[PDB]
Ligand binder design. Structure first.
Ligand SMILES: Cc1cc2nc3c(=O)[nH]c(=O)nc-3n(C[C@H](O)[C@H](O)[C@H](O)COP(=O)(O)O)c2cc1C
Ligand SMILES: Cc1cc2nc3c(=O)[nH]c(=O)nc-3n(C[C@H](O)[C@H](O)[C@H](O)COP(=O)(O)O)c2cc1C
Ligand SMILES: O=C(O)c1[nH]c(=O)[nH]c(=O)c1CCc1ccc(Oc2ccccc2)cc1
Ligand SMILES: O=C(O)c1[nH]c(=O)[nH]c(=O)c1CCc1ccc(Oc2ccccc2)cc1
Lengths: 313, 313
């Protein structure tokens, strides 16, 4: 009875890892995650140039989840490349490197230089398709024209196996169209569903005030709020993308959340808000919790139930 | 002291009402809704001919909220118009009628026949733009030109003041676009935000099964899950539609959920999932709690804090 997986030519102790943005911005952060029991980690989404991000407060958490508008605070690509290149201990667990260029050309340059490190060290690319486009347009994943462009270009530039981090969709025609774009691109080996539920608004009853300063308090939702929307996207894309892996991200607080996520067809399972709240000790708990779910049900491996959610009649 | 207000040339005993779909399909239900302390009611969305809807189970509720895919079960527009014109007691509260016809022409035929009863009897139109779209395309409000035609045609057909039922958006650029479309139409004097969060998927860990029968388990999300989505949309549209009203809907279990909604610009507060679980008694509770929030804070009127959510600079 194990949590083990072999995927994308790499070996993982368990399906669990952090979500891009959580405990992965600094070298201190990255080493923590590497010292945890996570089967993997992913670096904070980066840009060419370092960024301080938006004014604080810019993340707030509650019993039922999190709201954020961080604004891509990151140490910039050169650090994140150097860490993959010379600092990270691959003998511990695989590394994923997230990128979120503010245009097709910024992302292209980054993958070009990332190519030879991926090849020689095994660092894996998660292209974050919630990267901004021209302001006054939806983020790149809600604009299927620009999304096509970005992947045409990154494929040519990178010419290695990579992955995409997607927002949630809420209409069947959107699942249909987005999977169709993805399926044009054989090098997209995995798909991560979902990013934060876009532009929610949390209001404090006593103060009669939004809780985060940027964007008049509007921001991305994570946590218990988004788990059903997260399972839908996982399973939609699991259904419509049979040559590609899906990684689940969305309100995982427990082995059960993880278990459901896997049932929908998740391969790896990322923890965002909960990891931020609870800390890296969360991964031992999750591992134990899922294993006690599989023991009771008779499951020895993940592939025995991955994608095997039942429907009625 | 008391929450009574005036919108659209009507008197209301308080800002509370059911949400289209909940406790409003049968004559029985609408008599029940009428007999309750709600300030108003609205009838199940309807089509020209009656519909049976999709296979049960097609609604389920859990602690954080609900999932459904009813398939627009309804007694049919002839019944609801009869209720509006020969059966509703207008001295008790105002009545709102919801239409969700399967085409612009289905909708046109209904409003032409509704407009005379609106003139004389004062029923109020709430048009459901989560209604179906042409082949390969997402629901109408998620296809803005299609949305413009529906409003162009209904406005021409109806030619009295009316309102619209919106699904949530998740992008600023969509707020921007969607609001603009709505501002093209002066007869749209109120906007109801938001409809259920499209295409979530609840999975049961013990059965390893989805919980509702249609759409392989996928349906709309209501309840605690969507409150931070319903407030952003309430506020997004309140700010972008100064000459209109906004009706809030989504995640009201308490006076506090209500208070925030109002703070976010909301004139009427709709109740759906919580109404469906607790029953119409909820309306006496929701009054009391809101009144109690107002007292502690020293508010005498809804007008005093409506739309007054404080931003951090
Ligand atoms: C503070 C914070 C920072 C995040 N930063 C990133 C990021 O840099 N890149 C990215 O692709 N996703 C980012 N996300 C999205 C998360 O990866 C995740 O998809 C989302 O929070 C939902 O997961 P959760 O429900 O576990 O929080 C961030 C989320 C939070 C809360
Ligand atoms: C069983 C059920 C039936 C519904 N039927 C309709 C409908 O006919 N028309 C409509 O506009 N919305 C319908 N809705 C959506 C609600 O009016 C409301 O937008 C949604 O429940 C969000 O509010 P909540 O958070 O209180 O659930 C329905 C919701 C449920 C749960
Ligand atoms: O870091 C974030 O703010 C963030 N939060 C999330 O929940 N998901 C994400 O993917 C990210 C990073 C993606 C993102 C979010 C806001 C951004 O803000 C802009 C920065 C520059 C130009 C336009 C928008 C840029 C990237
Ligand atoms: O009745 C509902 O299922 C429902 N549930 C919601 O949460 N919000 C709603 O607005 C509605 C009614 C709107 C609706 C839902 C499903 C529909 O299903 C179709 C019927 C025929 C063709 C295509 C879709 C049509 C209208």
């Amino acid at each position: 009875m194990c949590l083990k997986l072999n995927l994308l030519d790499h070996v993982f102790a368990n399906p669990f890892m952090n979500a891009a943005g959580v405990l992965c911005s600094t070298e201190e952060d990255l080493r923590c995650m590497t010292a945890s029991s996570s089967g993997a980690l992913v670096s904070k989404s980066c840009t060419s140039a370092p960024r301080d991000g938006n004014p604080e407060p810019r993340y707030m958490a509650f019993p039922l989840g999190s709201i954020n508008s961080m604004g891509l605070p990151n140490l910039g690509f050169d650090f994140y490349l150097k860490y993959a290149s010379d600092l990270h201990d691959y003998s511990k667990k695989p590394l994923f490197l997230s990128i979120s260029g503010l245009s097709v050309e910024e992302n292209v340059a980054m993958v070009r230089r990332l190519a030879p490190v991926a090849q020689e060290k095994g660092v894996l690319l998660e292209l974050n398709l919630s990267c901004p486009n021209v302001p006054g347009k939806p983020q790149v994943a809600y604009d299927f024209e620009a999304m096509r462009t970005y992947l045409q270009q990154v494929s040519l530039a990178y010419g290695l196996p990579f992955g995409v981090k997607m927002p949630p969709y809420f209409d069947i025609a959107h699942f249909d169209t987005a999977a169709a774009v993805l399926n044009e691109f054989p090098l997209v080996k995995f798909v991560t569903c979902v990013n934060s539920v876009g532009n929610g608004l949390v209001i404090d009853a006593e103060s009669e005030s939004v809780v985060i300063k940027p964007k008049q308090g509007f921001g991305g939702l994570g946590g218990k709020y988004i788990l059903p929307t997260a399972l839908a996207n996982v399973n939609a894309f699991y259904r419509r993308c049979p040559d590609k892996l899906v990684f689940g991200c969305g309100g995982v607080y427990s082995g059960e959340d993880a278990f459901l996520h896997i049932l929908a067809g998740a391969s790896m399972v990322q923890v965002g808000t909960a990891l931020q709240e609870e800390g890296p000790g969360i991964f031992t708990r999750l591992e134990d919790e899922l294993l006690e779910i599989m023991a009771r049900k008779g499951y020895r491996t993940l592939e025995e139930f991955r994608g095997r959610v039942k429907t009625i009649e």
